[PDB]
């Protein structure tokens, strides 16, 4: 007949049950090639140890039931059909500590050889063990483990849509000028089993991010050297005046309230606190010198 | 939350039960052992937490 592609959509989806895994031979596993693009690091929580990022995610798999021949269908190659009208893999991330609000993509592309192309952006709230040892200049290494939460490796298996080097070097469509700088996203496949006879497919993504030591530069070193040179000015006061003692005390108070204010910036030892308590002790021995003379 | 006295945690939870209606023999089904079916297509227990 001649309703065109409307026939196709019917022909495929007439008796198509979206509950059963799309394989003619049930022994044949469905392989899902996935792709991850880092769009932005939204927020790092050092205290609660949790990373929040935004990812552009790609899912590719084969639906053996949605296959057809391009001919007698007016040479149609691919067809757009509703996501929730077809079988979809349950791949999730283990590091998930919450659920990020992400736009729902209603359509997917299914091609005549049964290739299903699923695009969707995800907001990932994933737990990550952070090490803030070198606070201003620290690198962070966070894992994103994509795996089917139920299906074994003989049912659902995960691969990479494109080369792992492409995935690694991909810094395109990513927002800089932020607190963090994306270094690389390193993909690695692993077969995880907690026992014999049951093995699952893992696809890890190591997102590595480096901090930008500029916002924390001025807010840290500038006031310290400021009160330092103010103290230096304070030495010029003659010991006889008596106002010199009040000088050192008031300055010590100011640096104290300063270190109490800057105490609420990043939790931990931060190690940079040592290079700070040095200044603290310097003002202390300065005061001790003043009261001595 | 010490003030409001409330704990927020994340748990990996496992449920195992017997569906007497979903039983079959592996043979004449091409020796299939288990089958993956949608959660909301079957009966599910209402187990929750009091706290």
């Amino acid at each position: 007949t001649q309703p065109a592609l409307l026939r196709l959509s019917d022909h495929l989806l007439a008796n198509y049950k979206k509950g059963v895994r799309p394989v003619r031979d049930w022994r044949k596993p469905t392989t899902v090639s996935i792709d991850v693009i880092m769009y932005a690091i939204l927020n790092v929580d050092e205290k609660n140890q949790v990373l929040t990022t935004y990812i552009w995610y790609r899912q590719y798999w084969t639906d053996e039931f949605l296959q057809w021949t391009p001919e007698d269908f007016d040479n149609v190659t691919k067809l757009s059909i509703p996501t929730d009208s077809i079988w979809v893999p349950d791949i999730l991330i283990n590091e998930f500590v919450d659920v990020g609000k992400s736009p729902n993509i209603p359509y997917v592309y299914v091609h005549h050889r049964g290739e299903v192309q699923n695009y969707k952006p995800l907001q990932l709230v994933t737990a990550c063990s952070l090490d803030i040892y070198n606070f201003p200049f620290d690198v962070q290494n966070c894992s994103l483990t994509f795996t089917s939460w139920l299906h074994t490796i003989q049912d659902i298996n995960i691969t990479l849509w494109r080369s792992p080097e492409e995935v690694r070097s991909d810094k395109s469509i990513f927002i800089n000028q932020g607190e963090w700088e994306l270094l690389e996203v390193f993909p690695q496949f692993k077969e995880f089993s907690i026992d014999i006879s049951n093995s699952y497919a893992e696809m890890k993504f190591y997102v590595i991010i480096r901090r930008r030591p500029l916002f924390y530069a001025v807010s840290l070193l500038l006031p310290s050297i400021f009160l330092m040179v103010v103290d230096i000015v304070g030495f010029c006061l003659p010991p006889d005046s008596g106002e010199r003692v009040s000088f050192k005390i008031t300055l010590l108070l100011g640096y104290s309230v300063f270190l109490i204010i800057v105490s609420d910036t990043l939790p931990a030892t931060p190690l940079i606190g040592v290079y700070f308590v040095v200044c603290m002790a310097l003002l202390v021995i300065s005061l001790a010198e003043t009261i001595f003379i | 939350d010490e003030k409001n006295q409330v704990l927020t945690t994340y748990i990996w939870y496992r449920q195992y039960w017997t569906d007497e209606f979903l039983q079959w023999t592996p043979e004449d089904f091409d020796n299939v052992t288990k089958l993956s079916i949608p959660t909301d297509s079957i009966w599910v227990p209402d187990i929750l937490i009091n706290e």
Epitope: K190, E191, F192, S193, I194, D195, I196, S197, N198 | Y16, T18, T33, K34
Partner: nanobody
Framework: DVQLVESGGGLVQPGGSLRLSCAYS????????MDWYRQAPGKERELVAG????????????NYADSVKGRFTISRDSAKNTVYLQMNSLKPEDTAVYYC?????????????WGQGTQVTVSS
């Protein structure tokens, strides 16, 4: 609940090779540990080889007896649902009935299961 079936046993000349297979089957089960046992006529049950996933949840960990230390190699295939025992350079002392012991967890609970075992006879 879970049934074990040994196979591959037969007659082989000394210095030869033979592969034993143990097929587990059932409904809902999880094999935590799989051991190979052999029992010579009159002699007790002897541990040959075992296998269990390591602390790291990826690669497995094998366990061999001092006797078959270098000759035997235990492996497994989760896809074929079968655990294998590769016997190389067979001695006449390797002649015995080989059973298999699976420590598995089912809906009933964690328990040990045994197969019927197969006869392995090494003679000239």
């Amino acid at each position: 609940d879970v049934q074990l079936v040994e196979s591959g046993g037969g007659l082989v000349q000394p210095g030869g090779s033979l592969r034993l297979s143990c097929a587990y089957s059932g409904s809902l089960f999880s094999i935590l540990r799989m051991d190979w046992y052999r029992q010579a006529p009159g002699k007790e049950r002897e541990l040959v080889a075992g296998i269990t996933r390591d602390a790291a949840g990826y690669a497995d960990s094998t366990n061999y007896a001092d006797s078959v230390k270098g000759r035997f190699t235990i492996s497994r295939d989760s896809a074929k649902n079968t655990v294998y025992l590769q016997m190389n350079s067979l001695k006449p002392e390797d002649t015995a009935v080989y059973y298999c012991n699976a420590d598995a967890r089912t809906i009933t609970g964690r328990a040990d299961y045994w197969g019927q075992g197969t006869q392995v006879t090494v003679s000239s």
